[PDB]
Amino acid sequence: MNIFEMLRIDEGLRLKIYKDTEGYYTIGIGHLLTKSPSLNAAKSELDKAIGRNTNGVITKDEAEKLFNQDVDAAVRGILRNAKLKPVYDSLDAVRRAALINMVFQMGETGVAGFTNSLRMAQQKRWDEAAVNAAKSRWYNQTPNRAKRVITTFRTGTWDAYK
Ligand SMILES: [Cl-]
Ligand SMILES: [Cl-]
Ligand SMILES: [Kr]
Ligand SMILES: [Kr]
Ligand SMILES: [Kr]
Structure with missing residues (x-):
């Protein structure tokens, strides 16, 4: 078990934009897109994150990339x-x-x-x-x-x- 496996169990994996328990737009493995109510805002944020026109849908691969980034940033934040x-x-x-x-x-x-x-x-x-x-x-x-x-x-x- 490691951090990736652990958070992967805790956040799950969704390929289409969804709302979290808080009702925020999110995607992948716990990748918060935005706090705004705007699903449009959310697709925009998504598109910018992925670098393409997702249209609210990403691949598994894309999801694991955001996740690698997010783990990484988490660690680096701690260390700073x-x-x-x-x-x-x-x-x-x-x-x-x-x-x-x-x-x-x-x-x-x-x-x-x-x-x-x-x-x-x-x-x-x-x-x-x-x-x-x-x-x-x-x-x-x-x-x-x-x-x-x-x-x-x-x-x-x-x-x-x-
Ligand atoms: Cl829970
Ligand atoms: Cl991003
Ligand atoms: Kr603890
Ligand atoms: Kr703690
Ligand atoms: Kr704790």
């Missing part, structure tokens, strides 16, 4: 975030994956806000931090995913993903 980088570096590899997952899903920003947990996470207080992260809109909104991610973070194993 001053709050984040140090937690990251302190982590073992499974746990690092958990952090990247959250960052991909919520942004450096949304993640920036788990300060209380993350501190505990920097401290190796697996249980404490896990319980605190649970007190989050994040968890209440996508409890099953949230659960898998928090378990991975806490245990440092992929059990949740088997």
Whole structure:
């Protein structure tokens, strides 16, 4: 199991523009197109992303390309975030994956806000931090995913993903 496999399980794969749980236009493997209501806006954003006239549909290949990019940007964002980088570096590899997952899903920003947990996470207080992260809109909104991610973070194993 690795980060790609993990997020691929958590975000799925859709070839046609769809709305996420939040109702935002998205495509591929969790590739948010836009926050705007405009499906037109969304095709435009899509076209620009792919470099062609998609007409709201991409191939698998295209989807995996956005995904590679998105994973990559997620990692690089972490590493340029001053709050984040140090937690990251302190982590073992499974746990690092958990952090990247959250960052991909919520942004450096949304993640920036788990300060209380993350501190505990920097401290190796697996249980404490896990319980605190649970007190989050994040968890209440996508409890099953949230659960898998928090378990991975806490245990440092992929059990949740088997
Ligand atoms: Cl893009
Ligand atoms: Cl979920
Ligand atoms: Kr955390
Ligand atoms: Kr955690
Ligand atoms: Kr966490």
